[PDB]
Amino acid sequence: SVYDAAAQLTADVKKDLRDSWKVIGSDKKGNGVALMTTLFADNQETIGYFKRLGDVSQGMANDKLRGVSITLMYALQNFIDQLDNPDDLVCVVEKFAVNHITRKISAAEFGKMNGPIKKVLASKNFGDKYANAWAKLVAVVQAAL
Amino acid sequence: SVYDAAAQLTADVKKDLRDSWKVIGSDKKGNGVALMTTLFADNQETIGYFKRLGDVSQGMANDKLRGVSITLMYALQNFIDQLDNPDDLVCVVEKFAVNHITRKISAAEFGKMNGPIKKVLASKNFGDKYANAWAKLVAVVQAAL
Ligand code: HEM
Ligand code: HEM
Structure with missing residues (x-):
């Protein structure tokens, strides 16, 4: 259950999440777009769920993809x-x-x-x-x- | 259209947005719930859009409402x-x-x-x-x- 899963976030796990986010969360646009483009490259089968975004291969130049990528980081x-x-x-x-x-x-x-x-x-x-x-x-x- | 509306966001306006956000955004759960509960209090009709949240009269205590409120602030x-x-x-x-x-x-x-x-x-x-x-x-x- 979601409640049991949350309890798995131990002290050190939380600390490592914060320590890495401090760096990763510093560039939401850049790392966010990197996250999405890597998802589509490594798992092309997921592209179908993002039809609304258009041509996903454009990356950063795709306004809708950039919008979703930035929002994902928040x-x-x-x-x-x-x-x-x-x-x-x-x-x-x-x-x-x-x-x-x-x-x-x-x-x-x-x-x-x-x-x-x-x-x-x-x-x-x-x-x-x-x-x-x-x-x-x-x-x-x-x-x- | 959206770009045109963004044009009204002058240097002074952005400055006031940032300064006020520094305080308002410092308690996302508290102010987020304040915004939602006030909306419902002043415009009861808007509750029709939030049937999924259940008993909104519980305010902060309502897990679903609290979830939407915090997220709204992000x-x-x-x-x-x-x-x-x-x-x-x-x-x-x-x-x-x-x-x-x-x-x-x-x-x-x-x-x-x-x-x-x-x-x-x-x-x-x-x-x-x-x-x-x-x-x-x-x-x-x-x-x-
Ligand atoms: C770290 C994991 C993920 C995070 C934090 C995340 C975050 C988000 C956020 C915040 C939105 C925008 C708000 C919304 O429309 O609901 C979104 C949209 C979406 N997400 Fe996720 N997501 C994740 C993984 C995925 C994966 C792996 C898929 C599919 C294989 C997926 C499919 C979608 C779809 C289809 C949308 C709608 C995009 C659009 O049309 O604008 N998400 N996600
Ligand atoms: C400053 C104004 C507002 C902000 C920043 C805001 C923000 C958000 C965010 C972040 C979400 C969660 C993502 C999503 O599901 O789309 C959301 C959901 C929602 N918003 Fe807004 N919103 C605003 C005003 C309004 C108003 C005035 C209404 C209704 C009259 C509204 C109705 C909804 C509804 C019904 C949902 C779905 C809630 C749920 O069942 O989870 N929003 N909004």
């Missing part, structure tokens, strides 16, 4: 900000899950963002320890899907 | 952060407008948030000058609806 910002209060983290995660459920995004589908996150993290000198930390946060959302 | 955070780049502000405003258009929320209906905003600002001692600045930000989003 969702991550939101999650990180709620790490101190599990009750708040959960209600925000559930809200966030509602819109993805409406788009029929499964927990398995949602989990594909883990690849992109791991790569962007590694490009900034953050290794497996951090990728695993972020995977735990993603799992919280997966539990609500 | 949309504003997004906008404030994009003020110095019209291109980015526009793509993020248009993305934001997509979900509200799907909900059949007209520009006039969206404008009802001006009252709550003015009242929340007043509670932190930000007068009409600041309320006017925020009305202009709301006008940019209204231009997309």
Whole structure:
């Protein structure tokens, strides 16, 4: 359950999330677009869910893609900000899950963002320890899907 | 159209938006809920759009309402952060407008948030000058609806 998943965010996991976000969250536009373009490159099958965006290969030059990419980073910002209060983290995660459920995004589908996150993290000198930390946060959302 | 509305965001207006946000945005849960509950109190009819939230009379105590309220504040955070780049502000405003258009929320209906905003600002001692600045930000989003 989402409540059990949130409890998996231990002290050190929370710390690693904050430490890496401090760097990653510094460039929301750049890292956000990198996240999306990597998702579409490594998992081309997900492009169908983003028909509204148009030609996704344009990257940064695609206004709709840039809009979604920047907005995506503020969702991550939101999650990180709620790490101190599990009750708040959960209600925000559930809200966030509602819109993805409406788009029929499964927990398995949602989990594909883990690849992109791991790569962007590694490009900034953050290794497996951090990728695993972020995977735990993603799992919280997966539990609500 | 959206670009044209963003043009009213002059140097002075952006300055007041940033200064007032520094305070208002420092308690996203508290002020976010204040905005929502005030909207519902002053315009009871807007509750019709939030049936999914359940018993909104519970306010802060309502997990779903609290979830929407906190998240709402991150949309504003997004906008404030994009003020110095019209291109980015526009793509993020248009993305934001997509979900509200799907909900059949007209520009006039969206404008009802001006009252709550003015009242929340007043509670932190930000007068009409600041309320006017925020009305202009709301006008940019209204231009997309
Ligand atoms: C770290 C993981 C993810 C985060 C934090 C995230 C965040 C967001 C946010 C905040 C929005 C914009 C608000 C909204 O329209 O609901 C959004 C839109 C969307 N997301 Fe996710 N998302 C994630 C992963 C994914 C994945 C992996 C898929 C699909 C395989 C997905 C599919 C969608 C779709 C289709 C939209 C609508 C885009 C549009 O038409 O504007 N998301 N996501
Ligand atoms: C400053 C003004 C406003 C801001 C920044 C704002 C922000 C947001 C955000 C961030 C979301 C979550 C993402 C999404 O589902 O689209 C949202 C959801 C929503 N907003 Fe707005 N909004 C504003 C005003 C309004 C107004 C005035 C109405 C109605 C008259 C409205 C109706 C909705 C509805 C119905 C939802 C869905 C709530 C749910 O069931 O989860 N919004 N809004």
